[PDB]
Design a protein around this nucleic acid. Structure first.
Ligand SMILES: [K+]
Ligand SMILES: [Mg+2]
Ligand SMILES: [Mg+2]
Length: 84
RNA sequence: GAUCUUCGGAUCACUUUGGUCAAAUUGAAACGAUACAGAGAAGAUUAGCAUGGCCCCUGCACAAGGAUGACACUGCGACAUUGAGAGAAAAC
């Protein structure tokens, strides 16, 4: 019954190159291509952040709108705007 | 707010938001490699052009190529049974 707090103060930026020798970025399909297919179920890297309702939930600007949706990023816990 | 008007007001303008979709593991494709076989015509080597379509790829193309591009190329019962004999059964 208190305003919602922001979880991640920073913005996770995108910079990563798999398999340094044998990968090249693909402009059309925005993903790295070439190199070993690699296990389909291998990339899974444990998530870094985690959330619970108790310490995180609260009011936000979307509570006013009757048809508002939930944060894709609150559940995964990197909503970096808070109550805004 | 600007213009007049006579301090009543009149003019002038008047409803945005191109949305494969919210900051990239879990809704834009198609696969590397290793291991197996491993190149059409009845001996052997080998030119090709076709036929068929829920197979495509390269191409601007209704040219032409990709192993003659590849796969496929088979096969069965609107047979009426009587022709006869034998042992049985039921029957000339
Ligand atoms: K040939
Ligand atoms: Mg041809
Ligand atoms: Mg052919």
């Amino acid at each position: 019954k208190q305003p919602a707090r922001k979880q991640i103060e920073t913005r996770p930026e995108y910079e990563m190159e798999p398999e340094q020798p044998g990968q090249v970025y693909n402009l059309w399909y925005n993903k790295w291509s070439g190199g070993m297919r690699q296990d389909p179920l291998k990339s899974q890297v444990k998530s870094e952040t985690r959330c619970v309702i108790s310490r995180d939930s609260g009011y936000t600007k979307a509570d006013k709108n009757p048809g508002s949706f939930f944060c894709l990023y609150f559940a995964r816990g990197m909503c970096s705007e808070g109550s805004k």
